[PDB]
C-alpha cells in the first residue's frame, strides 16, 4: 500500500473552482478527472489544514488524501512574522500524512505543494512520534517526494525536520535513559555521521573541575549521575583559523529543582530541561549535514539537578569559572548556574557570536507561551538575523529586554557578586537573562529562553503532542544564512 | 445533501470477511457491491467505534460513513456491567454522525444496527451541542432512521436521548440565563408539552417560608436571585390515588461556595450544580413522553449559593422542615442543606420510592470519577432495579455504603442535631449521604451522587465535551421498567 | 480624533473569582489604564496640541456579592459578541470589550488602550517596560520612539492568532475571557481585546507591570507610578507635529 498526499488551494474570487497544485492537477488528469469529480461530490471546499480522503482513484494509490493549502499566494504575514504559505503547507501536509498513517499505510508520496522544503518539514515533523519504549506503535510511514523535480528542496526539508526531530527525541526520552552521558553519546554519533570534519569531547567531571566550573559542579553534585561537559566542533570553514560561532545549551537531563524541590504536578516534563542542549546540538548536527562553510562550536554542560545529602543548599555561594561568586538562593534556578560556566568557557574560542538556548524560566512561558522563543541579545544585528530566519521556518522568536534594570535586581546580592534569583518575582525571564549577561562580555550574544516552546499540545499543527524541539530549525536557518551572508 | 451511516461488525474467525448489518448489505447490493469493494480497497478493517467515509457511491448518498460496531453478538459484559453491544452501537453511530456533520451535511439516515434505540441514542446524544450562544455553529443535522422497520425502537432512542439532552442543555446553560425561575419555566414547558396529565408549581419564596424550609432558605438568601421550589406532577397511573414515585434533585443553579468560597479554577462548571434537578426533571419529562402508567412527583429546590452581606455564615444553625437543626460549618456543602428540606417534603406524598440526584460531592468524583453514578440506598431492591436499568442504558451506577459509621461523623455536632460536613475529611460522599439520610425515614430511598458524571471529556464516546446529563436515561429506564414490573 | 481607552476598575477584589488577600490593596490602582490615558489627554490639552482626542474610560468596581458576575456566565458585548466569563477576575478585558467597541464609533485615526490587565505582563517584563500589543508597526514605532525620549519604556508583545485561538476556543460563547492554557497570559488577554477591534491602528498597553514603583525608576518614590503617561503625551505631541 502506497498513499498520496495532494494539495488544493482555497478558491480565489476570480476562479470558478479551487485550484489543485501542479501535482494535484496532474494526478486528476491521470485519473481522467475522477479526483475533481469526487472532491466536488464530497461537499464543501477544503480549507487550510483540512483534509479529505478518497479511495480507489488509482491502482497505485488506493488512498489519496487531499489537503487544503489555503491561499496560493500567501506569503510573509506582517502580523504573524512568518511566511504564511510555508506554515499552511507544513500543517496541511502533516495532517495529510497523519491520515495516511491512521490508514496504516507504510509509504506515502507527498505533493511538493509549490514548496518542497515546507512540504517535507510538514511530513517529517508531522509524522514524528517518540515511541521507542512502547509495545503498541503506529505504522512506520516512509514519506517521499511525489515527483522528481524538487528533490534538493525536499531533502532540505527532511534535513531541517530531522534536526528538529533529533532534538524532540533527546527531549522526550525519559531522563533515566537520556542521561548526560547518553545525551553526549547520541549527539556524538549524530554529529560524526553528519560529517568527519568534526571533533567531540565528552568532558568528564575531572575536566570540569580542572576548568574551575564551580557553578556547574554545584548543580551536578546533588545527583549520583555523572556530569559531562559536551564540547563539539564542526570545522566547516575553508579556513581552519576562522573564528567559530559558539552555541551553548542548558543540559539539565532532569530537574527536580533540587533542595528547592519542584511540585509533583507535571514534573515529568523536566526530562526536557536539557532542551537547550538538544536544540543547539541538533542545529549543529544539521549544519554539518548541510556542510555549511563555517566553524561552529557547541557547548553543553549536562547534569541532573537532584536533592540529596550533598546537593546545592539555598544560600550556598559558588564560584564561576570567571571568578565571580554566585549566591544560590534557589537551587531550582540551576540552568543559569551551569550556563554561567559554559558561557565563560565559550569566550575562550574567540567566537564571532555566542548563542545559548535554555528551557530557562517558567516566566518565559507565562510571558509568551509557545507562541515564540524569547530572545535576549545585546546585538540588534543578531536579533534581526534570528528574526529573519524565524520568518522562514515559522518557528518564531520574539525579542525580550536586556536592561540594566533587571541586572540591578540580580547583582543586589547579600553574600556574593550575583544572586541566582532576582530580588523581586517579576520579569523572571529578564532577570534570568540579566544573570547570564554577567558572564558574557561578547558583543554578539543571544540568549534564547525556550521554556515556553519546550512542548506542544496543538499550537503548532505539524507537531504532535510532546516535546517540540523548538526552535532548532530557526537556528539551522540562521546558520545557513550566516554561512552565505554574514 | 443527505448522508448515510452504515454499520459493519468485526470479522469472526469463521467468517471470510467482516459482515455488514442488514442495512449495510442491502445498500452494498444497491450499489452493485461497490461499498464492499471500496471498503476492501480502503485498507484495514473497521474496529469498534472507528469510521471511514466513502464518497459518490450513490446519487442519493454522496457521503456514506461506515462505522465499526465491534462483535455482532456482544451482549452483557459481566465485567463492565453494561450491554456492550448497545454501547458499541451508541459510540459507532455517534462517530458516524459527527463525521457527517463535519462534512456539513444537514440530513443523515442512520442504520438501526440491529438495535434502533441504541442507534438513535448514539446519533442524538452524539450530535448534541449546546451552541445557542455562539455565532459560529456546526450545521444542524437531522438524523432519521434508515428504513422503516424499526420505528418505535428508533423513536424510543430519540426520546431517551432527548431527555438526556434536555438535562445537558439545562446543565450547560450559563447560570445568568439558567436561573431558578428559568430552569423551572423550561422544565414546565417541556413537561406540559410531554403530557397534559401534569401539574407544575413554581413555588415562590413565600411558599418555601410557609413550608418552614429554613435549611433551603439559608442557602438561597445569600444571592439576589429569587429561589423557587419546583414541584412537578405527572399523573400517569390509571388510579389517581396510586402512591407516586418521588424524585428530588439538587438545583443549585450556580455554586460559588458562598462564604466558604470556592477556588477560581473551573468554578464555571458549578453552573451545572443543578444537574441533580436537571436529570430527575428531564427523566420525568421523558416518562411523561413515554406515557408511563405511573404517578411521579418531581421536587427541585432551586437557588444560587452566593457570598454577600446576608449569606449563610459558617457555624450558623438552621432548622430543617422536620425541625432538625443543622450546623452549617461549610457553606459550600449547600446541596445537602436544600435537599434536607426537599427530602422532608417528599415524604408528604406517601411515595412508593424516593430517589434524589445531586452533584453532591467532589469526593464522589475522586471515588469513581465519570465511570459511574454513586448510588446510596437503604433498599437492595431499589439498588438492583437501578443497576439493571443502568446495564441497558450503559449509563452505569455503582453502589456506595449507607453505614451508621458515616452517620456518626455528621451527628457528632457541636451546636446542632447534625453538622453539614463530617468531622473527618474522609469518605466525603458517604458522610454527605449519611447527612441526607437523617432527613429520610422512607424504606425505599436512593441517593445518586452524580458529581463525578456531571461532565464528559471523552469517557463516554457518544457525548461531546461538556455537561453530560447523566444518568438521565438510567432513571428513565428505571421508571419504564417500574411501570411494567414493580 | 485619536481615541484613548483605559481600564477603570477603581477597585478589583476579583469578584466571585476572589483574589488572595496579600497586597490586594494595590488593586485600588486597577484603574491605572484610565488614569494614564486620561492624564495624557489632560496634558495634551495643556500643551494645546492641534489634534482631536477622545478619551474613553469605563469605570466600576469588581466586587463579590449576591448579584455579582458568576463564573461561566455569558454576557453580550456591545458588538453582539458573547463572552464566557470563566474567571470574574479577568474583568478588565470585559469592560474594555465594550469600550473598544464604542471607540470605533468615533472613526478614530488610532485607538490606544491602556490597562493594568495581567499579572502575566508583570511576570513577563516587570516594571522594565510597558507591554505594547499592536497590529500596526507604524504605531509601535511611534510609541517606541516617544518612549526613548521619556525614558518610560515600552516593549512590543505579540498579537498572534496563536493566542486568539486559545480564547475563541470557548465552550459556551464566541470568546472566553481567559485562555484555555495558563501560558502567555498577557498575550491571550490581548488576543481577547483584539476580538473587539477591527481598526487598522490599534495598540493595547498592558501596564500591570509598571503599575507601581519600589526603586526601579530612581525619580519615582515608592508607590503607584503613573506609567507610561509621559510616553503617551510625547506620542501625542509628536503625532500633532509629524503624523
Ligand atoms: C523553569 C525554571 C528553571 S528549571 C524554574 O523552574 N525556576 C527558576 C526559578 S524562578 C523563581 C521562583 C521563585 C523565587 C525566585 C525565582 C526557580 C524555579 C521556579 O520557577 O520555581
Ligand atoms: C461538590 C461539593 C458540593 S458544591 C463541594 O464543593 N463541597 C462539599 C463540601 S466537602 C468538604 C470539604 C472540606 C471540609 C469539609 C467538607 C464543601 C465543598 C468542597 O469540596 O470543598
Ligand atoms: C491582573 C489581572 C487583572 S485584575 C488578574 O488578576 N487576573 C486576570 C486573570 S489571569 C488567569 C488566572 C488563572 C486562570 C485563567 C486566567 C485572572 C486574574 C489572576 O491573575 O488570577
Ligand atoms: Na530528555
Ligand atoms: Na446550568
Ligand atoms: Zn530548575
Ligand atoms: Zn532547569
Ligand atoms: Zn457547594
Ligand atoms: Zn453544590
Ligand atoms: Zn481582576
Ligand atoms: Zn483588573
mmCIF file of N, CA and C in Angstrom, chain B residues 115-125 150-164 290 473:
data_model
loop_
_atom_site.group_PDB
_atom_site.id
_atom_site.type_symbol
_atom_site.label_atom_id
_atom_site.label_comp_id
_atom_site.label_asym_id
_atom_site.label_seq_id
_atom_site.Cartn_x
_atom_site.Cartn_y
_atom_site.Cartn_z
ATOM 1 N N UNK B 115 -30.209 -2.599 16.573
ATOM 2 C CA UNK B 115 -30.758 -2.066 17.814
ATOM 3 C C UNK B 115 -31.047 -0.591 17.565
ATOM 4 N N UNK B 116 -32.202 -0.314 16.968
ATOM 5 C CA UNK B 116 -32.594 1.051 16.632
ATOM 6 C C UNK B 116 -32.549 2.035 17.792
ATOM 7 N N UNK B 117 -32.923 1.601 18.993
ATOM 8 C CA UNK B 117 -32.879 2.527 20.116
ATOM 9 C C UNK B 117 -31.441 2.953 20.394
ATOM 10 N N UNK B 118 -30.527 1.989 20.450
ATOM 11 C CA UNK B 118 -29.127 2.307 20.706
ATOM 12 C C UNK B 118 -28.586 3.195 19.585
ATOM 13 N N UNK B 119 -28.973 2.889 18.351
ATOM 14 C CA UNK B 119 -28.519 3.675 17.209
ATOM 15 C C UNK B 119 -29.013 5.110 17.343
ATOM 16 N N UNK B 120 -30.287 5.266 17.687
ATOM 17 C CA UNK B 120 -30.871 6.591 17.850
ATOM 18 C C UNK B 120 -30.169 7.350 18.973
ATOM 19 N N UNK B 121 -29.932 6.677 20.094
ATOM 20 C CA UNK B 121 -29.265 7.330 21.213
ATOM 21 C C UNK B 121 -27.878 7.801 20.790
ATOM 22 N N UNK B 122 -27.166 6.962 20.042
ATOM 23 C CA UNK B 122 -25.844 7.347 19.586
ATOM 24 C C UNK B 122 -25.895 8.586 18.709
ATOM 25 N N UNK B 123 -26.842 8.615 17.779
ATOM 26 C CA UNK B 123 -26.967 9.751 16.877
ATOM 27 C C UNK B 123 -27.411 11.023 17.591
ATOM 28 N N UNK B 124 -28.468 10.922 18.392
ATOM 29 C CA UNK B 124 -28.996 12.088 19.088
ATOM 30 C C UNK B 124 -28.086 12.608 20.195
ATOM 31 N N UNK B 125 -27.535 11.708 21.002
ATOM 32 C CA UNK B 125 -26.629 12.133 22.064
ATOM 33 C C UNK B 125 -25.328 12.602 21.422
ATOM 34 N N UNK B 150 -37.878 -0.390 12.062
ATOM 35 C CA UNK B 150 -37.557 -0.269 13.483
ATOM 36 C C UNK B 150 -37.935 1.094 14.045
ATOM 37 N N UNK B 151 -39.071 1.618 13.605
ATOM 38 C CA UNK B 151 -39.515 2.939 14.026
ATOM 39 C C UNK B 151 -39.745 3.184 15.511
ATOM 40 N N UNK B 152 -40.479 2.306 16.185
ATOM 41 C CA UNK B 152 -40.729 2.533 17.604
ATOM 42 C C UNK B 152 -39.431 2.523 18.399
ATOM 43 N N UNK B 153 -38.581 1.540 18.120
ATOM 44 C CA UNK B 153 -37.306 1.420 18.812
ATOM 45 C C UNK B 153 -36.460 2.659 18.549
ATOM 46 N N UNK B 154 -36.447 3.118 17.301
ATOM 47 C CA UNK B 154 -35.677 4.304 16.963
ATOM 48 C C UNK B 154 -36.211 5.506 17.731
ATOM 49 N N UNK B 155 -37.523 5.709 17.685
ATOM 50 C CA UNK B 155 -38.111 6.837 18.392
ATOM 51 C C UNK B 155 -37.908 6.726 19.897
ATOM 52 N N UNK B 156 -37.863 5.503 20.413
ATOM 53 C CA UNK B 156 -37.649 5.320 21.845
ATOM 54 C C UNK B 156 -36.256 5.859 22.158
ATOM 55 N N UNK B 157 -35.313 5.567 21.268
ATOM 56 C CA UNK B 157 -33.950 6.034 21.442
ATOM 57 C C UNK B 157 -33.882 7.548 21.388
ATOM 58 N N UNK B 158 -34.585 8.137 20.425
ATOM 59 C CA UNK B 158 -34.612 9.587 20.295
ATOM 60 C C UNK B 158 -35.176 10.196 21.574
ATOM 61 N N UNK B 159 -36.247 9.596 22.083
ATOM 62 C CA UNK B 159 -36.882 10.087 23.298
ATOM 63 C C UNK B 159 -35.926 10.037 24.489
ATOM 64 N N UNK B 160 -35.292 8.887 24.697
ATOM 65 C CA UNK B 160 -34.345 8.732 25.795
ATOM 66 C C UNK B 160 -33.211 9.744 25.648
ATOM 67 N N UNK B 161 -32.642 9.816 24.449
ATOM 68 C CA UNK B 161 -31.544 10.740 24.180
ATOM 69 C C UNK B 161 -31.973 12.196 24.352
ATOM 70 N N UNK B 162 -33.179 12.524 23.899
ATOM 71 C CA UNK B 162 -33.681 13.888 24.023
ATOM 72 C C UNK B 162 -33.832 14.254 25.496
ATOM 73 N N UNK B 163 -34.232 13.276 26.302
ATOM 74 C CA UNK B 163 -34.383 13.522 27.723
ATOM 75 C C UNK B 163 -33.026 13.890 28.295
ATOM 76 N N UNK B 164 -32.009 13.114 27.937
ATOM 77 C CA UNK B 164 -30.665 13.390 28.427
ATOM 78 C C UNK B 164 -30.165 14.726 27.888
ATOM 79 N N UNK B 290 -43.267 9.076 27.402
ATOM 80 C CA UNK B 290 -43.424 7.639 27.222
ATOM 81 C C UNK B 290 -44.809 7.226 27.702
ATOM 82 N N UNK B 473 -30.970 8.794 31.334
ATOM 83 C CA UNK B 473 -31.527 7.610 30.685
ATOM 84 C C UNK B 473 -31.705 6.434 31.636
#
